[PDB]
Amino acid sequence: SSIKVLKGLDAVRKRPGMYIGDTDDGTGLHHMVFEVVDNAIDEALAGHCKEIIVTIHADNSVSVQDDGRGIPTGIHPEEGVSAAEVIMTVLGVGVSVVNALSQKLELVIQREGKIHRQIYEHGVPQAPLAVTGETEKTGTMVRFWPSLETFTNVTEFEYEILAKRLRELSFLNSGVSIRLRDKRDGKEDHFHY
Ligand SMILES: Cc1[nH]c(C(=O)Nc2nc3c(OCc4ccccc4)cc(C(=O)O)cc3s2)c(Cl)c1Cl
Secondary structure, X not given: OHHHHHHHHHHHHHOHXXXXXXXXXXXXXXXXXXXXXXXXXXXXXXXXXXXXXXXXOOOOOEEEEEOXXXXXXXXXXXXXXXXXXXXXXOOOOOXXXXXXXXXXXXXXXXXXXXXXXXXEEOOEEOOOXXXXXXXXXXXXXXXXXXXXXXXXOOOOOOHHHHHHHHHHHHHHOOOOEEEEEEXXXXXXXXXXX
């Protein structure tokens, strides 16, 4: 299972434009955010998520936080690791593509009364998903640092590109609240049809 996962991550890194879009003109870079957001939108479509928060951090990482069910955390029997880790690492291109093309990715899940956290580097988990505390909230937070071994030329997120797509998704999923926050300059928008 471990050997197949590393090979799948490698397949994405070998042909990244094919999975995420052009890696030099900023298309693929912004599609990384859109893939994560799309998973949060799917959680809204299923009737669980009401609010999505997208943050451009000061270090040009992006986080997406939802208030959905939380990715399942229990051990998946075939692989012997958390279901969350399987979803994050086994190949709508799937969040595993974003993980494969991220120098670092942080996952925080609130589910069944617990907070769970895991860190990845180039898709490789640094430790098993672990409990960090108790919570009465539910949801998923993914923060990723795009790999500059993949993304060239356009490496800094464009607020306006994200804002336009999130406004579209708020209109097309009326009822969902989407917040966009830029920690680089303090800009914020709230989209809620
Ligand atoms: C920001 C974000 N949110 C999510 C997310 O909420 N995904 C979820 N998938 C799931 C989920 O999906 C499991 C799954 C679906 C398709 C393929 C493999 C596993 C199941 C259950 C459940 O049964 O309670 C809950 C959730 S929440 C993802 Cl993935 C990302 Cl990235």
